[PDB]
Structures are given as structure tokens and as C-alpha cells.
Symmetry: D2
């Protein structure tokens, strides 16, 4: 289960670089130089890294400081063969963003948020990023009067439309991926799920430029089925990027290593990504727990990739097993994939087999055989076949 | 706080008619004749009633039985002046629907589900319904292999497209409202939130025919902000209908009377519906607790309407209070409603006040004054001004 | 992974006998004769069965009907070698219990609940049960004024004290196991967790007669760590019985087969039961999904036992692996098991190494190595070592 | 609704002093001098303040620095008449506590945690505190192998027993209050609810010295009924202290001002505290949102006390209303408070009215009238009578 760069595993600088500060806790690890993170991730068999602007270039850097930070980072990428497939803006840490970036009540803050984003889009394109993620972590409210959500969605549409006008004006190939989260750090965050983000994108001026960047733990913070949400994103043609991690249900955002948290959901996610032929990065947005030293950081990062590769093997073995193929037919997964009424509406209306002569009791009596299918899935996951 | 028919309060037959059967419990009340429910709701000042097909006409009724059930119901509507603004199909109770209606793995069940729906659309139009709700309560899974969600969404789109072709073919004015729910009775339900339903509708052949029927308790079963979801539905132009009730956060679907459960969310919901000029029914999809006798049923129904009218008064007083209007300006709700960059992208890029000369620390220091605003909202809700 | 009767696997009659009625759904399966359930469970390698009074003897049975039901059941036990280690009372289904049994506001209902329980304690003892479970599913409220919880806990203590006086008066060896659940069917249930039940037992007149019957899904409906709660019950000496099933976090009570739901929690539960030498029944309180026919019922029941046996193997292999034993020492699990201050309070106060000369920074720098340990646990669970 | 010092409202230094750092965010407010907080809280009509050791005396202070910090604080208390009813230890912020204080796997850390606590118990007693709170926020795990919970509970009992031996040895009157929380910052925290903490206390060597310090938001993070948990703590005689705040259900710990979050739960909590004659501090453990400036900090603190006083008025009016007293009898709250069987077990067994001649159908038919009672409660809360 040894990852290489072909497996397209990527990590945020902020993941292995997390110093362990939490709502109740000071740092437990020293800051990592991005150069060291690129080297150590490459040694583990990562394909690439991603960054917020402020991960790579300290906030308030001079042009000369910015140039030197990017030069050193570029040299580490060159030394290792590591890629940068995705970049994003920090519109959440600085206190100026305490009520939002794109949907701050203060108009001057909204304008600044856009300029900060646009500066980093240029850098993302220079470093070869195909995807530009937006996580509006400060967009939302703790109280009902603070935020008129129709006005906020007007401001959010304006911001994303301006970014689309910018990338079109420059002739950039980069596309946007909106990252939903239901809450934390705001009491409620706007576009709280994959569904809300997909729906919003349909009302942008150039919807083709925008998709989603769903995160395992974020949908699970609303108690939702992450594989189901990824299936709806794939169905819409909008899975531009994905964030992989672990979460133990409806809590604060844990950012456990991938495979931790809901293990069976991780299995069905990998099964879906691989069956669908998702071709994007397998990106880990996780935090090595603050209990760990740097040896534990690299162990946790290695475990992200290991767990993906184990689950990939077990899901492929499940789908390829003739006994599973028979069980899928027994459960009418083949019939689910057939059109209901390719004969058309009038034929359906005229079909006595669909109403007057439909034996509801005979149909009702037919077991779905889902438990046998699911125990074959369990046996494959556990290597108990 | 006395409701009349102008307040457009409506109730499902299945709400006050709930006999109190639950996963662990037999009925605690006798069946209600729909005629008696129409009479008793009219006496409380309801405007109208809604029905599933199988609430009004027992499943498996003869044509002569169907005619007599509808005749008696029509006479009760005529006697009272009660309306029927909305109807819906029961695609969940009968064991034939144990794996779904429109997304059953069995194709013959999908075809039957459509025929059952179409028969009741005709009846809905006869009784003057403007909205036809679809709650796909059986669409989903308890296990990952049982349901390929891309195939299921293909079947769901086919079904809704066929219903749109049907209503267009007949020249009906009736529109559809998809009701999301995240889980229960299925382990996970497809289109689990307002966002997922809005996103799905954008991929139908005639999206203009479809909106959402959000339910307070359903979004709250995913821990979501119901007023925020209603704001996104309004923003999309898709709030065709609404279900009002109470829920105590992330649990089984409680269907408490409206105002019970999350009282402050009920306040901000009424504030939003009234401010937005929502013109649809104020429909209660609730269950008088099975502790109650019929006197408690009618008390619980009366309390739905009373709580709406109290919250309407308090929200209107909040918005009209000059001290609140001042607090809204202090919190820059006025600025939230102003375009970010009506000057356009190039002007924004050229604006030094948006980047090079933006005083981030001065902006960051400016308090949002949200707590004062929210305590004025609390004082108005509690009548403590 | 073939279960025999030595593995002490037991099932409720109501589990495989569940006809599939849910809040939104009619039965999908015919009623099972308890005789058939005993035969089919024995063939799967179960050790025994458990019952509510009303599972074995229809409510309102004559003495002659009661005798015949028990005779037939006894013959099936004799035919198979199946045991009855546990029995319980149905104080939830009949509408008389709509506000509770032991904590009904109506005193006449409380008295009836006790008489119904006492009659079934006699039968439990006749059939050789060692444990008598009480799940107060109707004890609680949907509203704040309906139930004064101090008065209700007074009535609950009276009821359990009277049952203890009864079993003492008869010279029965049977002990009680209180089953917590946080909600469903009541909006909130009294004694909602293992902790609340343990705390309550300490205030009974004969606490030694009472323990807990924790259920996987019930603690998980409060988002709690089920293995941690079982550890506290073991620590208290109060794990008299356990209910095994699956749950997907904070939802309605799913009662999935054991191993479904939170698979890693199932692993750590089996690890704890086996490491602690828990000697009680491995009882499954689950519901084959209503999608299934009888073949799926028996597959789901078989899967409960299979998953326990797979997880038992993997947990034993984890604990026996010298690499894991080394990792446990690296993570100071050995030090956790050592007394903090066997030297006593005065020695601790006088120990400069504990304060004035404690190198907080050196201690803080020491990694816990928990991620390496947890990935060895993951590798063992998945058979990827 | 103007608070005075008689209302016994208290605040942590860390509440109004919270600088607004969150998992995703830098400080939005400057540090407050405790002297300024004591002055500003006194002006709002607070009775007193509480502290962690490290709130009052910076970690790593010299004896001379410690003396000056305490002198200045004492002068502010003297200037204002403010009390210090409660103090506590910070066993969570410093990275040395990354795996716990009392249940750290490292024994040297456990010993240090005890010495740090004992030093602050002395200071608490000097400043007149009656209660010493322990919130074991770092006691727990993110992974199953990291923490053997039976061993951890052995270490937790040792620590609390040593603290009890210490206060007994010194002749201090101060008592301990254990503060449960289910998760955050650990993936799962030991003693996650009021029930678990009550149960644990019964196994300490001197249980009379220990109670609970329940926090509104903490029980609500497990989806539990906070008034019900407070009722069980009162029933046990163990409500030594309480933390008041707001929470919007199952999320990260929000620490909203009291009355925010679940408003009806706040109503039923105040009703219970006042009806029970709870005599302890009404302590607010809240965080003014980081959106706020210092004017918003003091508004949020004022709103904590205002909301308590409004709810106190409305609950008293509810209980005193003859129509409510009649409704409580109609719902048999009077019967709930009567013993089930003061006639004794044998009389109950011999009572045909309790079984053979109990009319279950007549009892079942009797409505509980809970919805009318609850709408009187709603009308009182909203001032709509
Ligand atoms: Mn996350
Ligand atoms: Mn992410
Ligand atoms: Mn509902
Ligand atoms: Mn509904
Ligand atoms: Mn259960
Ligand atoms: Mn159970
Ligand atoms: Mn808190
Ligand atoms: Mn607290």
C-alpha cells in the first residue's frame, strides 16, 4: 500500500504544518518551513501540495519577502517533482474578516477580500494550479438580525461573478471550487452543504467556471452521507476537487487523518471515486492531532495515503467479485440503472401493468436482499472472504 | 392572536388525524373522518386542508368508494369555505414502496409510483390545489451497495420530468414542490436538504415547474439554520410552499406544533416570511403528541396558528422600532445590501482604497454591534422592551 | 467465523421477529412464531433468545392461552438447547403507557406497570433468566411542564426499590439491568445515558441488585463514545448485560446489525469486552431492515455474529502483536495504569520534581505517538499488516 | 430587569476577557486587565467573578509578580464589593496538558497537574471561594488505543481523592464541582455528561466533598435536555455550581450569552432553579462573539443577566397563574408527586385494582392535556396571556 506520485495524493501546507492551537490550547509544535513540508511529503510519496496565500507568504510581507518565499518554495517543488494543483485564499484568520470576506457587512472589507483573492489567483496560475478553492468560513452569523441571507447571497454571487470575469479577462484555465461547511467558526455558515453550494453555482453568470470542493468531515458535521453528496456532485458534473479526512459525526471539525472517523463511509467514498473515474487530486485537509510530535505528523500523513490505498484495493475486489456481481443483480442494482419509461409518458399512461394490473402485494413481498449484499461488502472491507 | 381564513393557515388531514402510532407504540386515538377534521379546523380559523391520496381515499378503494369519499369531503369544504391549496401522494406507507417510489430499484414499482402520483394530480386539480408536494421519504438507503445515487438521481429526474410533461400536456397550472428530509425512515434520504433539492431542480427539463416545500423540523434534523435555508430558497425564487412545525435539534422527526422546538428559529422564520412577502399557505405538518385526546389535538392545532401570529406581531414590532432601525445601521445591515463593486472589476483592481491603502487594522477594530442588535430582538420576542 | 453456542450470542424475539412497521410504514413481513425464531436462530449458532412479556404471550391472553404459548416456547428451547438468559417487560407499546409505566403521571398506571413487570419476573425466573432488563422508553416528556423530573425520579426509585424487595422476598438470584436511551419515542427520556443510569442506581435501597444494559445505538444517539461508556460501566462493576447493534450517529434509533454503523467503535467495543473478560450474553437488539424478506432476516442475524467474531480476531491480534505492545509503551499506556501518587499526599507536596523542578517544556515536547498506534490498530482491523 | 448583587450573578474573568481567538481566527480584542473586568462587571450589577489560576496570574509568574497580580485584584474586589465564589485550575491551555492533567498518560504530568491545582486551592480559599471547579477538558482521546478508560478513571479517582485529602488536612470548607463536557477539545472527553460525573463521584472516598458544575451548552452538545440533567443533579443533592450560556444544539461549544441558543430550555432551567430554591451563584461561562468590540462585550454580559431576570419573572407568573395550577392538576402533575405504593409491596400485590380489575382502556383513553399546559407556558414566556 505504498503511495507514489501517480496516486495524485496532495496535502495542504496548513495540514502537516498545523502547530496544534485549538480553542482551549496553545501550540504543541514549532512552525514548519514550507520547504521542509514539501521535502517530507515527497519522501512519503505525495504528488503535490496546496496553500492558502498566508501559508506560503506571511500576511503583510514586502514584495522582496514575497519573492524570496515563492523562490524557496519553487526550488523545493523543483528538487522533489512535487506539483501545486490547487491554491486558496485565507479569508478567515485576520480579524478584519471577523464578519466575512465576500459577505462582510462592511463593503470596504468585501472589496479587500476580492483584491486579496485576485492577487493569489495570479500566484496560483504561476505555480500551475488548475483549481482555486474558496472556503467562506467567516460567511454567516451567530444571530438572526446580523446577516440578511438574501443580501449576503447577492454579495456572494457578485464576488464569484467578479472572480469569473477576472480569470476570463486574463485567459486563465483555472476553475473555482466552493467548499461548503455547515458551521464553525460561524454559528451557521452560508452554503452549508454540497447541495446549497451546487444550487448557488447555477445562479452565477458563468456556472461552468465553478464546482464544489466537498470535505468528508464538513458534510458529516451536518450528519449527512458524504458518498451520497459526492454522487450528487458527480451527477451535476461539479466535483472539481475533494478534501479527504475523518470525522466522528456531529461535533467540532476534527480533521482526523483519512480512514479515521467513519471508516465504512471512507470505503464507500473510495468505491465511488474509483468507479466514477474521478481524475482530480486526492487532497487531504487534515490535522495531525496536537498530541503528536513531528514523527507523528509524518505517520498521520502516511496513514492518510495508506488508508486510501487499502480501501481502493478492497472496493475494487468487492466490485470484481462474481458473488458480489450476482448479489447486485439479486438486489436489482441493474434495474435501478434502467430508464423507468423510455417508452414515454403516453405508453406509461396506457400500460395496465403499471396500475390496474400491477400486483402490488407480489412486488411488496420481493425481498431486496440488501443485508446479504452489505455483509459481502463488510467481508471485503475486513479481508474476511 | 385569533386566526381567520385570511392568515392562510392550512393543515394536512394526516396532522390532526394522526392516530399516535410510533416505532414503539400502538394508536392512542381513533381515526378521524376527514369531514370532522375540515369542520373542526374551520372552527379554529384555518383557511384550508391538504391531503395525501391515501388520507382522503383508503388505499385499494373501488371507483364508487372513491367517488363517495371525495363527495363527502367536497360537501365539508363547501359547508365551511375551507380551501385545498396543496395535495401530495403517499409513496411511503405501503410495503411496495419499501425501497422507494420514483427511485425503487424495481422498475415496475417506479412505473406504479408515477401512475399513483398522476391519478392524484388529476384529483388535486379538481379540488383547486395550486401546489403538488413530493416527499421522497423512501428514496435512499441503509447500506452503501443498495443504492447507486447517480443512477437513483437519473430515475428521480426521469420521474419529475414525466410529471412535468403530464401537467403541461393537460394544461394544468399546478406546480411541484420537492420536500427534502435528511433521514427517517431511510438511513439516508436522497435530496436530504433544501440545497440538494434546489440543485436537483436546476437539472430538470422544465425547472420553472418545480420548487421546494421545506419543513422546519427536516432542516433542523441536519442541524441546519431553517431561516437561512428559506432565505436561499427565496433568493432562488423557489419557495412554492412551506411546512411549519417544531423540532428539538438532531433527533427523530418530532413534528411538534409550530413555535415548539427552536422558538428563536420560529421568530426569525416568521420575520423572513413576512419581510419577503411570502404569499403561499402557512401550512402545518405537525403531530399532536400521542399523549393527547381529541381536545388536545385541537388545542395543539390552535397553538400552531397562535404562535405564528404572536411571532408575526413581535417580528413586525422589531423591524418597525426606530431603536432597532438605528442598531441595524450600526451593524451595517444597510451596507450588506449595497453592491460590492457596481464600479466594475477594472475600477476595483485600480482602487488603492481596496488594497494598498486599505487600513485592515482600523476595519478590524470596528465592532459589529451584533449583541446589542440581538438583545433588542430578544426583548421584542419576549415583550420586554 | 462460525458462531457456536459457546460464543454466548443471544437475540430478542422482537429482533428477527420485527415485522417492519416504522413511523411512516406498514409491515413488510408476516409475524414469526417464537418457535420458528428459536429453531432458525439455533441453526445459525445462537446460544439463546430473550423476550418482552408481550412478545411471548399476546397482551390480554387467558391463563390457558398463556400456558400454551409458554409450553410451545419451552419445547422449542428443549428441542434446540437454546437458553433464555434475559427477559424484560413491554411498558411502551400499549396506549395505557403513553406517559410512562413507572413514571406515568397517573398513579393507577404506575401500579399496573409494577404488577405487569412482577408477573413477568416470575416467568423469567421459571425460564432460567439471570438478568431482567428495564427500558423506560415512555419515561420522559415532549414539553417542560408535563414532567417534574425530581418527582419522576422519586417514582422511578420507588418502582425499582419495590422490584428489589420482590425478588429478595422470593429468594430469586435474578438481577436488574437498566437500559438508557436519550430520546425516541419520548422527546427526552429519563436516565438518557449510561452515566445517568449508573448515578441513579447508587440511590436505590439495594444498589447491588441493579446494573446497566447499555445499547450501542442508544449512546451513539447522544453522539457519545460507546466503548468509553462501557469502560465506565465495567469500572463501576455494573455491566450486567449489553445490547449490540449499529447506528449512524445522531438520528432515530436505526438498530442496524452489529458491525454496521460505526465499525471502528464496534472494533474498540469488542476489544474492551474481550480484554475485560465480560462473561455476560453477547445480545443483539437489532432490526433486519424492512427492505428484507425472511432470507434477509436470517442473513442479517448471521452477520451480527460474524462481525463480532471477525472483530474479536482482529482485536486479539492487535493486542498480541509485539509491534503494538512496543507502540503501547511508546504512548505510555503502561504509565497510565500506574498510580499517580502511591507515595501519598505529603510525599507529592514535598516532591520538587512535581512542581518547582518539573521541566514543563521537556514534558510538553514529548510526542504521544498515538497516530502510529492508531494506524497499527487500523492495519489490524483491515487485515493490512 | 435590572440586576443587583443580590441576584448572585457571577462571570469568569475568561468570559468578558476572551480575546476572540478560535480554531480559524486570531484575536479581535486586546487583553483585559482583571481590575477593569471587576470594575465593569460591578457597574452592570454583577455580584462576583471567578478565575482559572492562569487568568489571574500569568503562567510562569515569579512570587513577586504573583503577589502584585493578587494585590491589584483584591483592591478591585474591595473597591466594588465584588465576591469570588468559585475558582478553578487551567489544566488545558499549556501544551504539557495535551494528553490531560489528572489522566495524562505521563505520570509526571499527572503529579504536576495535582500540584498546580493544590496551589490554586490555597489561593481560592484566601479569596473566599466556596466552590472549586474541575473541567477535565484534556481528559480523553481522539483514538481508541491512546486511552484505557478504566485506567484513566482509576487515575481520575486518585487525583480527586488526593484533593479531598488535601482540603480535609487544611480544614478548608471549600467543595469540588466536576464540570462534564462530551467533546472538544478532545475527540471524546471522560465524564462526558452530568450523569457520568454524578456516577463517578459516588466511587470517591469522600463523595460528600464533590458535586457537579453543569454547563447549559455542554449537555446540549450531546443533544441532552439541560433542565432534566439539572433536575437529576438536584435530586442527588449535587448541584454545587452551574454555568449558564447558550448553545444551538449539536456543534462546537458556542458559549453564547445566556438566553441565546435554546430559549425555551433557558425558560425551563430558570423555572427549575427558582422552584428548587437553588442558592448557588448564577455563573455565566460565555464568550461575547469575536465580532464585538468592548462595548459589545459589556452589552453581551448585561444580556446574560437581563435574560435570566425576564425568564425568572415569566416562570414565576406561569407557576402562580390559577389557570396554570388548574392545567397542572388536569395533567396529573399532582399525582406524579404522590408515592406509587406507600401501602407497600404486599398491598400492591393483593390490589386487584392494580391488575385483574385495572381498566387499561379507560386509563389509555384519558388525555394528558399536555399541549394546553405547554401553550399556557408559551403564552407566559412570550407575554401573550
Ligand atoms: Mn475540516
Ligand atoms: Mn477543507
Ligand atoms: Mn417532519
Ligand atoms: Mn412535511
Ligand atoms: Mn435501539
Ligand atoms: Mn435495546
Ligand atoms: Mn462551553
Ligand atoms: Mn464552563
Amino acid at each position: 500500500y505504498q503511495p507514489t506520485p501517480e496516486d495524485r495524493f496532495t496535502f495542504g501546507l496548513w495540514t502537516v504544518g498545523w502547530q496544534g492551537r485549538d480553542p482551549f490550547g496553545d501550540a504543541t509544535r514549532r512552525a514548519l518551513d514550507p520547504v521542509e513540508s514539501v521535502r517530507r511529503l515527497a519522501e512519503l510519496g505525495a504528488h503535490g501540495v496546496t496553500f492558502h496565500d498566508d501559508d506560503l507568504i506571511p500576511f503583510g510581507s514586502s514584495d522582496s519577502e514575497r519573492e524570496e518565499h515563492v523562490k524557496r518554495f519553487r526550488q523545493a517543488l523543483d528538487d522533489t517533482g512535487m506539483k501545486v494543483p490547487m491554491a486558496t485564499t485565507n479569508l478567515f484568520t485576520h480579524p478584519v474578516f471577523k464578519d466575512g470576506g465576500f459577505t462582510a457587512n462592511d463593503r470596504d472589507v468585501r472589496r479587500y477580500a476580492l483584491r486579496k483573492t485576485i492577487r493569489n489567483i495570479d500566484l496560483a496560475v504561476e505555480l500551475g494550479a488548475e483549481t482555486y478553492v474558496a472556503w467562506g468560513g467567516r460567511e454567516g452569523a451567530e444571530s438572526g438580525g446580523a446577516k440578511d441571507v438574501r443580501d449576503a447571497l447577492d454579495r456572494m454571487k457578485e464576488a464569484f461573478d467578479l472572480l469569473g470575469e477576472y480569470v476570463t479577462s486574463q485567459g486563465y484555465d483555472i476553475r473555482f471550487a466552493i467548499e461548503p461547511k455547515p458551521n464553525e467558526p460561524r454559528g451557521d455558515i452560508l452554503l452549508p452543504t454540497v447541495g446549497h453550494a451546487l444550487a448557488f453555482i447555477e445562479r452565477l453568470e458563468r456556472p461552468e467556471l465553478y464546482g464544489v470542493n466537498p470535505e468528508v468531515g464538513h458534510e458529516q458535521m451536518a450528519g449527512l452521507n458524504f458518498p451520497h453528496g459526492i454522487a450528487q456532485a458527480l451527477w451535476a458534473g461539479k466535483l472539481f476537487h475533494i478534501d479527504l479526512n475523518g470525522q466522528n459525526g456531529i461535533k467540532y471539525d476534527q480533521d482526523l487523518r483519512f480512514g479515521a472517523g467513519d471508516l465504512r463511509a471512507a470505503f464507500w467514498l473510495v468505491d465511488l471515486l474509483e468507479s466514477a473515474g474521478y481524475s482530480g487530486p486526492r487532497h487531504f485537509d487534515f490535522k495531525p492531532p496536537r498530541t503528536e510530535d513531528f514523527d507523528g505528523v509524518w505517520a498521520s500523513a502516511a496513514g492518510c495515503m495508506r488508508n486510501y490505498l487499502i480501501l481502493k484495493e478492497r472496493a475494487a475486489a468487492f466490485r470484481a467479485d462474481p458473488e458480489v456481481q450476482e448479489a447486485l443483480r439479486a438486489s436489482r442494482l441493474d434495474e435501478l440503472a434502467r430508464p423507468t419509461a423510455a417508452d414515454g409518458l403516453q405508453a406509461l399512461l396506457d400500460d395496465r401493468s403499471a396500475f390496474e394490473e400491477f400486483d402490488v402485494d407480489a412486488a411488496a413481498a420481493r425481498g431486496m436482499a440488501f443485508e446479504r449484499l452489505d455483509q459481502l461488502a463488510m467481508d471485503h472491507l475486513l479481508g474476511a472472504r
